[PDB]
Amino acid sequence: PEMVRGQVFDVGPRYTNLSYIGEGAYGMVCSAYDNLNKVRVAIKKISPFEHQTYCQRTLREIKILLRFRHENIIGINDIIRAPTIEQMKDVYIVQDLMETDLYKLLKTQHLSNDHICYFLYQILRGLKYIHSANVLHRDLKPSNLLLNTTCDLKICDFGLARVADPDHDHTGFLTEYVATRWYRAPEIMLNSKGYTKSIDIWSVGCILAEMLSNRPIFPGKHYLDQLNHILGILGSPSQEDLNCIINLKARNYLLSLPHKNKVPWNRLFPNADSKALDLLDKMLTFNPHKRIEVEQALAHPYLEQYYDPSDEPIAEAPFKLDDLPKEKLKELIFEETARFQP
Ligand SMILES: N=[N+]=NC[C@H]1O[C@@H](n2c(SCC(=O)NCCS)nc3c(N)ncnc32)[C@H](O)[C@@H]1O
């Protein structure tokens, strides 16, 4: 077995000639030559079995990606692990090798309006399929948008996903922790558990804004700062929008704030396509009930060059873990990965 920076990759003999790509809290990513398909691939080594939460996220990722089949969602080509549960300490997920991701790309590259439009279309096309399966991604951000050398875009990392549950979405003030901070909708801090599809649309709007300027639009410095940045640009919510917040602690917090004017999108983004900014405004709408939904976004004039509902497929059947000990989760991961044995 070849090693990569102290990490053994028991991926042979099919996968050889490894190179380090990235690393995580219990995972490392490498590129490797697939000796069967005669192409280099990406492989992530996961070692989740000592920690229940890691097992949860691993099972979610595997179960969702194995059930989804869509051009704008990363597929799992192969899963490598030991032949028995007793011997299984690591799991290796094999995917198509993607040149970069949108986070890395935006560090150094400005995007043409044509690339912004194409990327946004692909994000929303993939998200339509996700949402049609009654799944919420719940952590959309540039680093979870993979890109290959021809700028095909594929959504990845479903470890934080959930089945939508809008009837149980309401909660109290300053309790919830959904998505990555900069991409987190205002209602997460106010009264939402992040169980409705509108959480993902907000994140896409944040990504669109970031594509327009290469800077995060709402760069909160910590959890409590995030609402400051959102309200600093959107301005004070209307009476109607406040009336939709029945929770008194959340509503009274907003009422306690001084009046703030909206910052016009075209002053923040003076180079941007006006249709892009119209769509941005509809995705970054404060009230989640008024926020545009994924199929409306696909139909927006900004995306008219690409929009084709007959070529924007949905899932064949929707999905319809917190209490399970890590031993049961390991057994489920073993069972879910059996199809690749061997
Ligand atoms: N460490 N870490 N993670 C972040 C780094 O790894 C890169 N990355 C990922 S992360 C999604 C995942 O866990 N996939 C499981 C199979 S690798 N997928 C990639 C892919 N398919 N092709 C090329 N690079 C990929 C990501 O762009 C960053 O460089």
Side-chain angles (χ1 to χ4, degrees), residues 32 43 56 71 75 93 104 113 133 157 185 187 190 194 205 210 216 221 229 232-233 243 265 307:
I43 304 183
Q56 293 187 45
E71 297 177 342
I93 299 179
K104 298 188 287 192
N113 187 46
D157 190 357
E187 61 268 19
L190 292 168
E210 199 161 337
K221 294 187 184 194
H229 289 261
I233 286 167
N243 288 344
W265 298 116
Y307 178 55

Side-chain angles (χ1 to χ4, degrees), residues 168-279:
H168 301 82
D169 184 68
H170 290 286
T171 188
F173 179 54
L174 297 182
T175 54
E176 299 311 301
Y177 192 104
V178 185
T180 296
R181 183 196 318 139
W182 292 344
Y183 307 93
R184 187 179 285 155
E187 61 268 19
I188 292 305
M189 288 74 75
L190 292 168
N191 64 350
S192 171
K193 292 195 265 189
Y195 295 175
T196 74
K197 291 172 181 174
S198 53
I199 191 69
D200 282 334
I201 294 296
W202 181 272
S203 300
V204 176
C206 291
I207 294 159
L208 171 57
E210 199 161 337
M211 286 194 288
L212 288 166
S213 68
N214 296 82
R215 294 182 54 91
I217 182 65
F218 308 123
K221 294 187 184 194
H222 50 81
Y223 172 94
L224 300 169
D225 194 44
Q226 187 61 25
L227 194 55
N228 292 329
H229 289 261
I230 293 169
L231 294 176
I233 286 167
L234 294 195
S236 301
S238 63
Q239 183 74 69
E240 173 165 282
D241 286 353
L242 290 176
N243 288 344
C244 296
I245 299 167
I246 197 168
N247 185 278
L248 204 40
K249 274 188 169 175
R251 192 188 290 190
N252 277 350
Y253 173 70
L254 296 168
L255 288 168
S256 75
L257 299 176
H259 184 200
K260 292 305 298 186
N261 290 323
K262 178 183 180 66
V263 180
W265 298 116
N266 73 335
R267 295 185 201 161
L268 292 171
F269 306 107
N271 289 275
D273 189 313
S274 62
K275 299 179 176 173
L277 297 183
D278 187 82
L279 180 51

Side-chain angles (χ1 to χ4, degrees), residues 21-23 29 42-44 93 95-98 101 104 146 156:
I21 292 184
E23 194 168 353
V29 174
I43 304 183
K44 179 173 67 170
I93 299 179
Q95 297 175 344
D96 289 351
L97 178 65
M98 307 290 279
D101 61 56
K104 298 188 287 192
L146 307 175
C156 69

